[PDB]
Design a protein around this ligand. Structure first.
Ligand SMILES: Nc1ncnc2c1ncn2[C@@H]1O[C@H](COP(=O)(O)OP(=O)(O)O)[C@@H](O)[C@H]1O
Ligand SMILES: Nc1ncnc2c1ncn2[C@@H]1O[C@H](COP(=O)(O)OP(=O)(O)O)[C@@H](O)[C@H]1O
Ligand SMILES: Nc1ncnc2c1ncn2[C@@H]1O[C@H](COP(=O)(O)OP(=O)(O)O)[C@@H](O)[C@H]1O
Ligand SMILES: Nc1ncnc2c1ncn2[C@@H]1O[C@H](COP(=O)(O)OP(=O)(O)O)[C@@H](O)[C@H]1O
Lengths: 686, 191, 206
């Protein structure tokens, strides 16, 4: 029998082997409704990895055994085909075909009405279960991209399925899932889980673990924290460790001192016995309280496990009409058990760091820090603290755009405090000359909000200038130009919801593409090429332009404000400009502002020198710093030429002199203005 | 007794027969954490040849004897199966199967909680230690390519392991290793 | 050397005594045997430097450079030269191979000098885009760089982008998830980085 490749999900439901399903009621109704059709009655779940496609099928198994299904599905055996163990457990040989025909024909013959679930069904499309006589009912699962690239390219097979879009849960929806799962993961690892950790896991998974989708990214995070405390609780506390070792040390010293015959040894041998006794007097109360209390936390955890097992037997008794055994458990066994837990737990808090058996926000922040590589100190700081000094944090990166930094900071504060439309993402149009900070501010925002430059995604509107390019942005219907690649924007929103979308040189976008941005800015959601609406409530929109550099001379001025804004009113329609949260204007950088930018860059070069072994300190004379700022600025490219200019004039020679030994450890690399050209001079002749 | 094919790594640790382990603290915590699970509690170390996969297991042997382990591993005998002397010391005949069942059943009966380390575990996939009742705890080691081509192609067996990526040390990390090993190799060769 | 070997053996017996709760024997070794031994080594070693090529009993950088030379087949003379010396005359060494691209040789040489001297981002590898007509030296300069930095043409690994023109080809570059097209072969780039970290990656016709 080819039960080697399938697991009975309906069986697992009767045995309490399926963790609870939270929410997702409308999706399970859709699956039931599709299955009950006679038309195309095979649902295919379409969603990103980890959004909960499988647990939807698991909920259906729970509904089949609980009679919460229509009659046509009540006596169904819902089987899950292990396609992973099928294609990987096989080679090019004819065993893939032979193995699947075997299972497909065991389904054929036996007389249970059987619904086959195949997760990652695209792996079966590179095979032919055309048993659509009404022999088998199938539930498929895959991602949207793989549905497009592998399932959508065999229409005849596809048309017998009906899409069910499974969107990613909100953070709020995610904690409801984690809260509902809380007790299962408590009893499983034998530890306790605080609610603030659950809120921490959901909020942090969405913000920093952008590589995996909710709620899986939050589930994996709590599960790893719990496993990290499963070993902490089975280890002696730190103070019992330290005490026990000094005690063993003093016992060594006592045996040794008792051998030496002299006046000073005997006076401290007696002191060593006392020090040993003092340690033992501090250690015995503690070591006793620890074991006393780890033995009870373990007695509680099995008390919880027999309770759960009783409820499985009780649910199955009442399901099978055995009222005799169902009365045993529901009225006597289970409340006798529940009374044992109530008493053992009540004394637990009453007994009363030590015995770490709790998943707290610290354990979540530490687990994430190891995975994400961000220092734990940066994850403990409250969002409210950062946002209150946001202008401070950005101004360390962006010079001379105080009016811009204030606008970005105020808009973000408006949304975490709940005063901005919750269906509209913050939207920005940066306007001003090249090399003034428009892109840089957006990078600083990315690293401030998500502590990662990757959190921003860049779209260059120079590549979306014609009406033909819209399919590149959102995708295309089947059989069209770029149906399979999808859209750049739509695919970015599905896989990186908490992102900053930078649209560079937005003035060049085709009017059809601008229309998509207005939908993004106004409704917080867009429609892809196939009518599907993808969500975007949790992104940030930054658009950059330079249509105002004509009226900005190096000097911010308020009369110049509407000459650039009237230049904007003809390129963009008034409804476009009205739906932008803040139209922000960058002015040209002054000579003093250009000079601090130079100090910023030497400070970074100074950091790499310090980050490596070298104790070389870069100091810049005033007039040399002045020539760098004069050679660096350009009325056309702003501060862009500055990074390369320093490299060419200062850094090239500074390298050579370091490796030549003409600037040694502990000395200063003095960069001067000699004969009107910036140079850095040696400190020792060759 | 099929001690012909295994060496007691925990014993070697008590006898000073394991050179020092430098760094690699987070990888040994991961191995301890995985082993302490009840879920999939068998680590598989995945790294290029010579990056230090074996010496990670050696460090765990040092931690077991030094009580620097959780309680569930304190009384564990960590055995290293010499799979090289097993498959090569054998032919097509039924001695590969008979030899491994012999060791797998000596592990079965005796009452020490025993963690089996099998380096180059892909050589066992071309066999069936499905003693996953909770009879044996296993630590595997292999390279990424051989994990993909020989271990990843038997899911049911793989899913009971949890990957531990062992990256190659930096040059800076390498001299810390050599510096820590310096005295051992000085006394050993007498130079 | 035997004084060191009995010391180590004493520490094994001492570690095991203190581990097994035998404080009697643990006090013998930790307080009397071991310091009596350590005192013997301190004296024998102190007179050793004080006594004062002859009696070669030291592993020095020369012994390392010679052992490598035998294995690698590179002359010992080329391994003793300091990295700082090569890098200072890098334009000289490359220009013996690449003619008429002085602006290119200077750029490659300056970038490499920026990174051994610690002024470039330590998380970013040096990256180059060679642009120009066929048969002008683009590939040849990269070979000369390989033989200058690693004294071996094999230190460079060549990827022809003419074989990565379609979106389908990415799995050839980095690999694929289990059950997909080239999951087992892996990626050409990812497998190259694991097994040859200190390499030059040449992407031709990017
Ligand atoms: N509605 C839900 N209720 C409880 N847990 C959920 C829910 N949705 C997802 N999960 C959890 O998320 C994890 C992964 O979900 P899963 O259904 O496997 O995602 P997918 O199958 O779409 O990849 C599982 O551990 C599961 O317990
Ligand atoms: N206000 C500024 N403060 C600091 N650096 C700046 C500023 N403006 C420009 N720069 C430098 O110039 C480079 C490019 O500037 P950017 O903001 O990308 O120009 P644009 O305004 O065209 O987006 C940045 O890497 C940064 O180093
Ligand atoms: N962390 C470490 N500390 C000390 N020595 C190490 C360390 N990692 C590797 N080594 C040394 O490297 C050599 C090979 O390492 P090994 O663990 O056998 O690699 P692998 O098992 O991954 O092939 C051994 O001689 C070992 O002493
Ligand atoms: N500047 C040059 N100096 C010396 N030889 C050259 C030069 N340019 C081309 N060659 C010769 O032409 C051959 C191919 O040149 P190559 O650098 O591979 O061309 P491409 O610029 O297309 O990479 C080399 O083997 C070399 O012998």
């Amino acid at each position: 029998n080819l039960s080697k490749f399938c697991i009975d999900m309906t069986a697992m439901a009767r045995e309490g082997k399926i963790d609870p399903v939270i929410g997702r009621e409308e999706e399970i109704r859709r699956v039931i409704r599709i299955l009950s059709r006679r038309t195309k009655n095979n649902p295919v779940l379409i969603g990103e990895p980890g959004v909960g496609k499988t647990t939807i099928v698991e909920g259906l198994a729970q509904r089949i055994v609980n009679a919460d299904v229509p009659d046509n599905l009540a006596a169904c055996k819902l089987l899950s085909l292990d396609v992973g163990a099928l294609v990987a457990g096989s080679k090019y040989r004819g065993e893939f075909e032979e193995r699947m025909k075997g299972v497909l024909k065991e389904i054929q013959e036996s007389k249970e009405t059987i619904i086959l679930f195949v997760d990652e069904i695209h792996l079966l499309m590179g095979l032919k279960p055309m048993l659509a006589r009404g022999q088998l009912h199938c539930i498929g699962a895959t991602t949207l991209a793989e549905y497009r690239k592998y399932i959508e390219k065999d229409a005849a097979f596809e048309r017998r399925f009906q899409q069910v879009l499974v969107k990613e849960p909100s953070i709020t929806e995610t904690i409801s899932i984690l809260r509902g799962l809380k007790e299962k993961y408590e009893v499983h690892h034998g530890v306790n889980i605080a609610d603030a950790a659950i809120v921490a896991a959901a909020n942090l998974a969405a913000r920093y673990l952008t590589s995996r989708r909710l709620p899986d990214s939050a589930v994996d995070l709590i599960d790893e924290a719990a496993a990290a405390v499963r070993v902490a609780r089975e280890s002696q506390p730190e103070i019992i460790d330290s005490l026990e070792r000094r005690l063993r040390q003093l016992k060594i010293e006592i045996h040794a001192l008792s051998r030496e015959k002299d006046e000073a040894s005997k006076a401290r041998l007696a002191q060593a016995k006392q020090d040993a006794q003092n340690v033992e007097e501090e250690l015995r109360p503690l070591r006793e309280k620890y074991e006393r209390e780890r033995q009870r936390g373990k007695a509680i955890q099995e008390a919880k496990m027999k309770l759960e097992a009783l409820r499985v037997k009780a649910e199955d008794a009442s399901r099978m009409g055995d009222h005799s055994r169902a009365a045993d458990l529901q009225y006597y066994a289970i409340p006798e058990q529940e009374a044992i837990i109530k008493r053992l737990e009540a004394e637990k808090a009453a007994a009363d760091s030590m015995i770490t058996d709790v998943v707290g926000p610290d354990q979540i922040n530490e687990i994430v820090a190891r995975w994400t590589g961000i220092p734990v100190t940066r994850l403990k700081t409250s969002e409210k603290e950062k946002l209150l000094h946001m202008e401070q944090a950005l101004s360390k990166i962006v010079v001379g755009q105080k009016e811009a930094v204030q606008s970005v900071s105020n808009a973000i504060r408006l949304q975490r405090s709940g005063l901005s439309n919750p269906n509209q993402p913050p939207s920005f149009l940066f306007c001003g000359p090249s090399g003034t900070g428009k892109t840089l501010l957006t990078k600083a925002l990315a690293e401030f909000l998500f502590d990662d430059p990757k959190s921003m995604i860049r779209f260059d509107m120079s590549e979306y200038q014609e009406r033909h390019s819209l399919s590149r942005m959102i995708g295309a219907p089947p059989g069209y130009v770029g149906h399979d690649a999808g859209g750049q924007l739509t695919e970015a929103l599905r896989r990186r919801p908490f992102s900053i979308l930078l649209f560079d040189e937005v003035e060049k976008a085709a009017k059809e593409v601008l229309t998509v941005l207005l939908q993004l800015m106004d409704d917080g959601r867009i429609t892809d090429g196939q009518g599907r609406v993808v969500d975007a409530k949790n992104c940030i929109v930054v658009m950059t332009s330079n249509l105002g550099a004509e009226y900005l001379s190096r000097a911010i001025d308020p009369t110049t404000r509407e000459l650039v804004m009237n230049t904007l009113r003809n390129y963009f329609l008034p409804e476009f400009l009205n739906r932008i949260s803040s139209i922000v204007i960058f002015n040209r950088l002054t000579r003093r502002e250009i000079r601090k930018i130079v100090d910023l860059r030497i400070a970074e070069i100074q950091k790499r020198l310090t980050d490596n072994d070298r104790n070389v300190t870069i100091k810049v004379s005033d007039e040399a710093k002045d020539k760098l700022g004069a050679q660096g600025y350009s009325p056309v490219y702003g501060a862009r030429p500055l990074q390369r200019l320093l490299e060419k004039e200062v850094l090239n020679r500074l390298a050579i002199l370091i490796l030549r030994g003409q600037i040694r450890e502990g000395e200063v690399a003095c960069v001067e203005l000699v004969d009107g050209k910036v140079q850095v001079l040696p400190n020792h002749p060759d």
